[PDB]
Design a protein around this ligand. Structure first.
Ligand SMILES: NC[C@@H]1O[C@H](O[C@H]2[C@@H](O)[C@H](O[C@@H]3[C@@H](O)[C@H](N)C[C@H](N)[C@H]3O[C@H]3O[C@H](CO)[C@@H](O)[C@H](O)[C@H]3N)O[C@@H]2CO)[C@H](N)[C@@H](O)[C@@H]1O
Ligand SMILES: [Mg+2]
Ligand SMILES: [Mg+2]
Ligand SMILES: [Mg+2]
Ligand SMILES: [Mg+2]
Ligand SMILES: [Mg+2]
Ligand SMILES: [Mg+2]
Ligand SMILES: [Mg+2]
Ligand SMILES: [Mg+2]
Lengths: 154, 53, 121, 261
RNA sequence: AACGUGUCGCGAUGGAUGACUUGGCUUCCUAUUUCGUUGAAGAACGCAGUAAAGUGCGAUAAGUGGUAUCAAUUGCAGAAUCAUUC
RNA sequence: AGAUGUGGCCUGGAGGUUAGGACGAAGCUUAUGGCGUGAGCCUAAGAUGGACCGGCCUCUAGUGCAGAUCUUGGUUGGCGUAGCAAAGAUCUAACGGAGAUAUACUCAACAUGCAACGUUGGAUACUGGAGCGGGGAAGGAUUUCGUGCCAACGGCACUCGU
RNA sequence: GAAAUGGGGUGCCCCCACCCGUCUUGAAACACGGACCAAGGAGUCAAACAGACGCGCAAGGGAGGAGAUAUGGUUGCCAG
RNA sequence: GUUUGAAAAGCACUUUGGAAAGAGAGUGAAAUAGAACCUGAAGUCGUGACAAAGACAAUGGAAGUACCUCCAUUUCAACG
RNA sequence: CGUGGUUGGUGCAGGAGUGGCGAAAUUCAAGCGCAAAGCAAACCCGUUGCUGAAUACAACCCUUCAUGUGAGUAUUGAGCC
């Protein structure tokens, strides 16, 4: 009940989805929106390069006083980061989507990532202890990621 | 503005209604037709009990 | 049983909070018209091991023998009325005894004493 | 109700409103507001009392002159018809039958009476209108609603047994006629069937204009305010049209061409 | 350009509204209707093949006896007989 | 400010009447128009819903919200921000572990799998006998111990754990 | 198989236009209350008089309490 | 409120993952009824498609226009 | 000479109260998206007559191949209690 969009040709498109990821929403937002037009192998290349800290993830919406870096001129930004926990959870999802392409009978080297959508999951409640006897919230904010990818060849 | 009204004397200053703090002092006749029926039912049960006096 | 009264909330309480000797009378089925006409009794509480045929539901027109009167679930269990799960294993499907008429009675000399008590002749 | 807490106001000096608040701690209701019409778990505005005026008292003559007025309108077939009743095959209004129906002992015989006196078209109006009531009231022992069909007025309490089971036909006694049934809804003109000897004692019960009643002590029927209730025949009679003003020739009307002004 | 802004379609978060109601509240009635040293109310600890809480019961312990009922209980096991009593 | 009028609108229930509903009622949705000066009413479409309900006349009331430092629930900007800076400190190899040495080609490796965990050995420190030593009271009451195990908790982490 | 008038939607131009509620002689105020939404949220009920109006009877009016029997009936209707 | 459904028929099996889960199949009228599971609002958010747009904070009024419109109504021939 | 069941003991008979038990008749006939629907404008014609604007819909359009109506307490027609 979850996919906002459906593929054109569903017999040439493999889906993948995360139930409740427990990464930060505001970092898996930009980790995942950067691969929304990329092929599967160029999107996987980007994530192995964010881990090596050779390329960065551009923070374009939930940036808000992050440090500005020299590597965000690739994306036309000034500030971006290397969110390694949102990166490696998106690598588990690209590996699920290409396993779901092989059992459909499809070549995973021809898959363009159509449709990345990240939405907010239900938050999880903890507690921090402030001065003067106060107790105030310490929420988690996890996320929902979904993607298909449609084959574009010849 | 008070006008040409009668001087009231309404006599309700002694904690008569049951509010959240008062048990009340109040007597309602909602069982009036059921005690009306009870006394007649019990006079017909008694007129049998004494018969034929 | 006398469950139906003026007050719905009290009537609908005495139905769903009924003991199993009240649930036996409430879980009754009509008799077949070759059997209603013999004993001169119109309906009968369902026992185990008496044969019935189903009259409402997707299983209507299905005969069989009653294998469980599951009074806590308000249902009946016919062996021939069943389906299968995902495993391929078969499970008995419950029917309310309203949707069912009896075609053969299972008779003991306490059940033959109920028919002489409900005999309309 | 709503007042069974030990709540007190926290006063002023905290950034919270000045209302009573639940004492204690360690629970989710503690510190929550109490004792007002707007707090949850608090008490309603002006909580209802059992010494409200429930019952009303009506003057005895003004109850009698309302039973008479709803009973006069059952004789008018235009008002019985404009109130819902299907009296299109009925022999006469006021319908009057004989007293042989006060000895019927089978409901199948009472049903052939209504077919023969042609009052079965209003019993079959009530059977069709049987539905489940709309709203909350069907949880409150008011599940089904029907319409009010014909009333059957008996001379006394007997002979009802064939008629008690028919859904739609109402029974009555002429010695005790209810206005709740002679004009249900506030609307006059109930269709009434009127047995023979319940109709021959209706001058002893209510009297006439010049002769009082035996049952109701001192009650004559109230005098008509108008002798002839047809005030348009007066407006059109030849001795009222005689004294009217002569209708003069009025001015010639306008035209599509305007006026000089 | 990027951020942003707006509008629609689809998703999420949220848990309102409607429908439902084995509950409350209010009224009225019927009694061979009113506890305890013959140990009460209350409190404690236990009791099942499986059993935390609750319900029921008290080392005869989710009950023994008797009467009525007349083939269940059932989450899973177990169980003489498959039923004039036993 | 105030008074009043309204065959003026709206909500719950009751008495009557007149009708709707599994060929889809209430509810919800709106670039759904229509019409009323207006409160509002009504139609249409839901790729919504799944069983109740409308109109008119009367009767009745716990009957109309935008604000009361209003009540209760939820959400949101701030904001991936302030911060997580006392009590010196960790390093190494081998094992364990899903937690790696993770790459579509025509590529030798660096420049495309980072970080982080436990155990034993080794190195380096610290506490410094008014001890991050070994036992008791009060308080706690299974935190003790073995074995599995990682959802949530141990504000970072965990394969570890009170 | 479209044309035509409207209505709705989004921009644009020229023009006009101070933030709402509140106390106050006077608030756009450098005066209070005011982040968003849903759901609740405040002239009620009884008693005594009075006036207006509706209704019955009228030198009379009307109970109340209680009886009575349709009902000494009925699950109920019917506490009417 | 446990109110999934008429009935658990409570998703066998396949292959990705250490797993949570995912992609398919399957049951059922319905799975956008998949387990505190009917309806699923407002606020808030993501995404696809678009409309644009300087800095006059925004909203607002009037009057046109530009583009759009799962909307209404009317008209199609010796006729509106 | 009568009387007392409230003198005590022995007996026994009805009732009430209490608890079990105890009634009528269609699963009637039409089959499924579409007539298991309507019309004949008080009543009566009518136990009768003639009647299909879903040749449906499934989302930018047309075509090709597919899927799609849970249970009748509804509807209609007969018969009952
Ligand atoms: N997008 C604009 C907004 O639409 C909102 O309302 C929108 C939704 O509430 C509404 O919901 C749609 C419905 O149209 C559509 N036909 C079917 C769909 N099931 C609904 O969507 C709903 O269900 C899905 C999952 O089922 C949820 O993810 C979603 O949050 C929920 N809105 O569609 C409405 C628009 O047609 C607000 N009313 C309004 O504030 C605003 O206009
Ligand atoms: Mg108190
Ligand atoms: Mg309360
Ligand atoms: Mg009866
Ligand atoms: Mg109120
Ligand atoms: Mg630091
Ligand atoms: Mg040292
Ligand atoms: Mg932690
Ligand atoms: Mg002033």
């Amino acid at each position: 009940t979850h996919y906002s969009r459906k593929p054109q040709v569903s017999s040439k498109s493999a889906k993948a989805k995360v139930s409740d990821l427990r990464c930060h929403y505001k970092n898996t937002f930009e980790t995942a929106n950067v691969i929304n037009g990329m092929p599967l192998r160029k999107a996987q290349q980007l994530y192995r390069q964010v881990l090596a800290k050779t390329r960065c993830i551009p923070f374009k919406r939930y940036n808000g006083k992050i440090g500005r870096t020299a590597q965000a001129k690739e994306w036309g930004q000034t500030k971006g980061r290397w969110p390694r926990k949102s990166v490696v959870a998106m690598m588990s999802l690209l590996k699920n989507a290409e396993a779901n392409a092989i059992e459909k009978g499809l070549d995973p080297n021809q898959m363009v990532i159509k449709h990345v959508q990240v939405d907010q999951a239900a938050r999880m409640r903890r507690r921090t202890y402030r001065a003067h006897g106060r107790i105030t919230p310490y929420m988690c904010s996890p996320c929902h990621v979904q993607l298909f990818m449609s084959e574009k060849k010849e | 503005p008070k006008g040409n009204n009668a001087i009231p004397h309404v006599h309700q200053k002694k904690h008569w209604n049951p509010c959240s703090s008062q048990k009340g002092n109040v007597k309602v006749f909602l069982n009036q037709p059921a005690q009306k029926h009870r006394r007649r039912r019990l006079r017909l049960l008694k007129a049998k009990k004494v018969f034929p006096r | 049983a006398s469950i139906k009264c003026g007050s719905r909330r009290k009537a609908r309480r005495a139905h769903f909070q009924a003991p199993s000797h009240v649930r036996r009378v409430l879980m009754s089925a009509p008799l077949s018209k070759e059997l209603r006409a013999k004993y001169n009794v119109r309906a009968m509480p369902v026992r185990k091991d008496d044969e019935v045929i189903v009259k409402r539901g997707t299983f209507k027109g299905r005969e069989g023998k009653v294998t469980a009167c599951y009074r806590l679930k308000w249902v009946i269990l016919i062996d021939k009325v069943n389906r299968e799960k995902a495993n391929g294993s078969t499970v008995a499907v419950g029917i309310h005894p309203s949707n069912v008429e009896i075609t053969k009675l299972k008779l003991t000399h306490h059940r033959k004493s109920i028919l002489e008590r409900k005999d309309r002749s | 109700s709503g007042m069974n807490h030990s709540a007190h106001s926290w006063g002023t000096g905290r950034a919270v409103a000045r209302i009573p608040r639940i004492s204690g701690g360690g629970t989710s209701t503690s510190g929550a507001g109490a004792f007002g019409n707007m707090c949850r778990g608090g008490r309603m505005f002006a909580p209802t009392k059992i010494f409200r005026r429930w019952h009303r008292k009506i003057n005895l003559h003004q109850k009698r002159f309302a039973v008479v007025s709803a009973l006069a309108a059952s004789s008018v077939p235009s008002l019985v018809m404009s109130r819902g009743h299907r009296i299109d095959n009925v022999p006469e209004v006021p319908l009057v039958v004989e007293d042989s129906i006060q000895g019927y002992e089978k409901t199948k015989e009472a049903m052939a009476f209504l077919k023969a006196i042609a009052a079965i078209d209003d019993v079959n109006r009530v059977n069709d209108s049987r539905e489940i009531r709309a709203g909350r009231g069907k949880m409150r022992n008011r599940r089904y609603v029907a319409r009010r069909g014909p009333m059957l007025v008996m001379p006394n309490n007997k002979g009802t047994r064939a008629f008690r089971n028919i859904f739609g036909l109402d029974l009555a006694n002429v010695s005790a006629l209810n206005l709740l049934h002679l004009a249900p809804g506030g609307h006059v003109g109930r269709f009434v069937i009127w047995t023979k000897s319940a109709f021959e004692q209706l001058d002893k019960i209510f009297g006439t204009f010049t002769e009082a009643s035996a049952v109701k002590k001192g009650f004559t029927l109230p005098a008509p305010m108008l002798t002839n209730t047809d005030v348009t025949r007066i407006m059109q009679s030849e001795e009222v049209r005689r004294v009217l003003k002569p209708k003069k020739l009025q001015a010639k009307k306008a035209s599509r061409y305007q006026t000089p002004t």
